[PDB]
Swiss-Prot record, chains A, C:
It comes from Corynebacterium glutamicum (strain ATCC 13032 / DSM 20300 / JCM 1318 / BCRC 11384 / CCUG 27702 / LMG 3730 / NBRC 12168 / NCIMB 10025 / NRRL B-2784 / 534). Belongs to the 2-oxoacid dehydrogenase family. Is the only lipoylated protein in C.glutamicum. The active site is at 223, 227. The chain holds residues 423 to 675 of 675 of the full protein. Disruption phenotype: Cells lacking this gene display no ODH and no PDH activities. This is Dihydrolipoyllysine-residue acetyltransferase component of pyruvate dehydrogenase complex. Is essential for both 2-oxoglutarate dehydrogenase (ODH) and pyruvate dehydrogenase (PDH) activities, but AceF has exclusively transacetylase (and no transsuccinylase) activity. The lipoyl residues required for ODH activity are likely provided by AceF. The lineage of its organism: Bacteria, Bacillati, Actinomycetota, Actinomycetes, Mycobacteriales. Forms a 24-polypeptide structural core with octahedral symmetry. Part of an unusual ODH/PDH supercomplex, consisting of AceE (E1), AceF (E2), and Lpd (E3) together with OdhA (E1+E2). It comes from the Bacteria.
From Swiss-Prot, chain B:
This is Dihydrolipoyllysine-residue acetyltransferase component of pyruvate dehydrogenase complex. Is essential for both 2-oxoglutarate dehydrogenase (ODH) and pyruvate dehydrogenase (PDH) activities, but AceF has exclusively transacetylase (and no transsuccinylase) activity. The lipoyl residues required for ODH activity are likely provided by AceF. The active site is at residues 225, 229. It comes from Corynebacterium glutamicum (strain ATCC 13032 / DSM 20300 / JCM 1318 / BCRC 11384 / CCUG 27702 / LMG 3730 / NBRC 12168 / NCIMB 10025 / NRRL B-2784 / 534). Disruption phenotype: Cells lacking this gene display no ODH and no PDH activities. Forms a 24-polypeptide structural core with octahedral symmetry. Part of an unusual ODH/PDH supercomplex, consisting of AceE (E1), AceF (E2), and Lpd (E3) together with OdhA (E1+E2). The chain holds residues 421 to 675 of 675 of the full protein.
Length: 253, 255, 253
């Protein structure tokens, strides 16, 4: 047959024609995501980042990174490091709003939530005090928290305290999405698929078309805490850090 | 013209509205009520994917004369999108589903009753193709022509409007690249088909990258996070994209 | 250090670790944007417009325009002129819905709200009866309203009566966003960053890849007032006006 089998799970065919009660994980993700949108003013701003230099740095230093630090070098610790630094530099984004008292709380800790796709459903463990971590420590924290999310070895403190979230919306091919932030958080950054795209490049003041590894970074922000220009300035810092790609010293090889 | 103002997609009949207050028709009043309510009782988000429609465009160009001669309807892109989406809803029963927030139970529908958004002068109408999973591309093309005609001429039947399990809306009919369409519970998804645009893209032939002109489309999927999470939305769209990019539809046209 | 300094305000570092009451402007923005989403059916339709001809017209006529009219010639009066003309042609978009009486009011005035980013927060002054204005008058109104927004010299009529809004979401680098409309308004058009992108061009029936100055125009519309097709037709008129770029007479040189 001409039907597509790509990303199709044959085991899900049994679901067809049935009514089944969902598990607690999914039941929580359902009542809480519906509520999140009603108690915040969410909007998603889109920026594109040229990941070609980070890709070249990753390709070059990955073998030594694996040998020294024991874990693989993916794109996620680069996104995490750039976002965590920008949350320190943009304290108005690493913040929570209280609609009753009209007070803004600017968190001194950057407790970064990481969305982890598991067979049981979406889980969002937190990297507490991520501002004190190096790229190797971030890479080991991701491996640890993702493993414990999939094998149900997460403590109650591992799921609380998050001040910002990062989610890989490009894990299943998406260019972008409008991820849902969960108050008290004021932002959630999605990392779209890193795709080769023709872009205009300027070298010595002359424009040319070149193939570059481009990513869309959609930021869902709460308009109660962050304005459009605030969201753009925060994303400009992240984009500048990633496009400059001065991370060789951060890898601690 | 005597002025530099644009006349493109301007309806001179709408000039009568300017400076007036009028009660909206029954279609508009319900669409206003339902869309406002829909967002308050669901967790909507729109995931975007791009699909290379060049092979479907080449197949359509080659087989359009024979399709119109045999089946009597024009061959548009919509039956290809409908066929790919209906097959993907069978393969992804978790998307062809409804959530009950009171009992926390998920119902996975055995029928794919595909809602089609039809723009009419009186407003938006959404007739349903019941049991679309049992239809061929020629039957789909005819059902679209029939339901669109009866929507515009107020001749829809009671069943033509109920039972929808998923919706497909042509947001590219009036030039849009993409949109964040509003899904209406009990449905869990609405796929929009953006405009098919010639865009320069990277093509990797035999391990070598090159820039080529391809007919690209954005397929925004609005999904309910109560029913579908980000990864399921991506897997569902990956199946649709793979079916459209492979473009093995020559037999499906039944010529 | 390798940290990015781009768009980082060192003065905001003082906020980190504190709880402070937000100012009147920010408290009202937070109240209005959370409420706006609950009393409307918002969705954002995206179109791209080739601004290359407007860029070439601007470059060519800017010296004469500044000399005659006394004000700079930016892209904003071209966007304002195209949107205001389209709101006259599409009275269904320059409208307000009353959900209690089910009546649509089609405004005869195009009172265009302009989003102005200020250090004290977002302000949205209104250009009343913008349909009667020329591009030189529009350019002067923008300079005046933006100045008085930043220097807190806006009067009560300057902030009321808006029938549509235009916001420069590309001011801090964004390609696009899903801006929040505020009822009674039914639409808010965002102007993304004007970026040089490689696009396909058809000259004498032959396709080629060329560098053009492209912009994304996201329109947030209220589905109570405007359908997807209505939004597309309204944006098609705007796109046609901008891509044709017949503004030489409008510059009143």
């Amino acid at each position: 047959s001409a039907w597509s089998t790509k990303s199709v799970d044959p085991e899900k065919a049994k679901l067809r024609g049935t009514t089944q009660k969902v598990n607690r994980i999914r039941e929580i993700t359902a009542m809480k995501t519906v509520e999140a949108l009603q108690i915040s003013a969410q909007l998603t701003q889109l920026h594109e980042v040229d990941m070609t230099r980070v890709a070249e740095l990753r390709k070059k230093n990955k073998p030594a990174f694996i040998e020294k630090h024991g874990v693989n070098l993916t794109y996620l610790p680069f996104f995490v490091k750039a976002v965590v630094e920008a949350l320190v530099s943009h304290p108005n984004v690493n913040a929570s709003f209280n609609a009753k008292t009209k007070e803004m709380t600017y968190h001194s800790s950057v407790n970064l939530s990481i969305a982890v796709d598991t067979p049981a459903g979406l889980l969002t463990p937190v990297i507490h005090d991520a501002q004190d971590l190096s790229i190797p420590e971030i890479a080991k924290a991701i491996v640890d928290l993702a493993d414990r999310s999939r094998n149900n070895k997460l403590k109650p403190n591992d799921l609380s305290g998050g001040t910002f979230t990062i989610t890989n919306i490009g894990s299943e091919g998406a260019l972008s999405d409008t991820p849902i932030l969960v108050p008290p958080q004021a932002g959630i950054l999605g990392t779209g698929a890193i795709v080769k795209r023709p872009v205009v490049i300027t070298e010595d003041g002359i424009d040319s078309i070149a193939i570059r590894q481009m990513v869309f970074l959609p930021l869902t922000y709460d308009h109660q805490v962050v304005d459009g220009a605030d969201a753009g300035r925060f994303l400009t810092t992240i984009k500048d850090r990633l496009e400059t790609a001065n991370f060789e010293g951060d890898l601690q090889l």
